[PDB]
Design a protein around this ligand. Sequence first.
Ligand SMILES: CC(C)=CCn1cnc(N)c2ncnc1-2
Ligand SMILES: [Cl-]
Length: 446
Amino acid sequence: MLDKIVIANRGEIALRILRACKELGIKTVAVHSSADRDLKHVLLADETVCIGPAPSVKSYLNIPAIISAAEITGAVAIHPGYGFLSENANFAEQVERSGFIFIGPKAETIRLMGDKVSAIAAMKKAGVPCVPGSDGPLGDDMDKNRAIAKRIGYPVIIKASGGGGGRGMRVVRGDAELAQSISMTRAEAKAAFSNDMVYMEKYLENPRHVEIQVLADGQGNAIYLAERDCSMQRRHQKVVEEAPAPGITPELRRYIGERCAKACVDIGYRGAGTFEFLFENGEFYFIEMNTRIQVEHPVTEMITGVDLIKEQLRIAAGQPLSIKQEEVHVRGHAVECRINAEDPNTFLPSPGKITRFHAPGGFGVRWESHIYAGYTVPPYYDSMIGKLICYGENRDVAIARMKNALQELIIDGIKTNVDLQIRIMNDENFQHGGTNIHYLEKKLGL
Ligand SMILES: CC(C)=CCn1cnc(N)c2ncnc1-2
Ligand SMILES: [Cl-]
């Protein structure tokens, strides 16, 4: 087991990682900005290093500062959590070059799956179903681009290869908009990624977002841990997640899971990862792979019993997976509501000082948050301040427990989305299940 690690993150996920480390007897080094001295996990960590001022560019994105912290404390590995540098292949490469273990895949694998064109080609080769598309980048020949659009069939969508997560894409429903849509998508990618590569895919009108959790070790084992539905979104930001996904049969779960596990073997994947799909008319279509742990991992933990952070750490130390595929069973149902410090009318972040705080409790209730009474949510980072996860023997019990837990949650002094989450739990279409990626925005419009 790893002697000591740097937790290269903040907020709820840093706390999540710290607890896993403590369970395994791994010493913790909490690197933090000057604005984050009073983070719960920093206060609980074995050692702390202030790596820079509040702005992320000088702290949580500061590669030299993070590697220096690892060097100075005699740490042996770095866990990047999610966001920040977790999908930064150059960072992973520098970590391993500097002699530390990166808790994630090989840098080459991060790079492969961080290029959407190259990622799709690899998934297609491995036998994972993808969206019909250009299977290659678009050039400047509009005769050729119209022909690709014709072959796919309108509507199509133009997507940046260096993008992802709903960033940098345009829907095209006819030839008259194709040239300008390609040109604008290209320009925005060049400005944002210094990578002007774009591709074309079939546009799916009303899909659900369904993603598959995998784990792969250094001994050749690769397993899938069922799926999560993350269709409840606003501007491509997930708001509620659940596992398993309503209406997915054991046969479908098996079909898609095995293809994901096989893909991991083919690409030499290591650690935790997620295959994201659009699901429509009973069919899966790969869009992207997240080569890292995700925000919503706890719903999969609740339904499988597998501690995914502890698995990441075990894999990094050179231990095989603690469970075999035949030992992975979906039991019960879990729902996650993201708790955001945000204004209810503008949806902009709403930082400030929490004056009273009370967490819900009870059977099947899991609260993931660093916040406490008297804690100030700083303005420099993401609006998500906690995650409420509720488990039940079925989806209805999970939803009932969430309603009750949301009612016990007290966060005064700042504006939050608790009331909105209560509205969603009480929504008759959500209670039925299987709502698509457009539903929340449709509801919020009403
Ligand atoms: C609603 C929207 C802008 C996109 C939803 N959507 C539809 N079709 C595809 N092929 C996609 N790839 C990523 N997202 C996709
Ligand atoms: Cl994430």
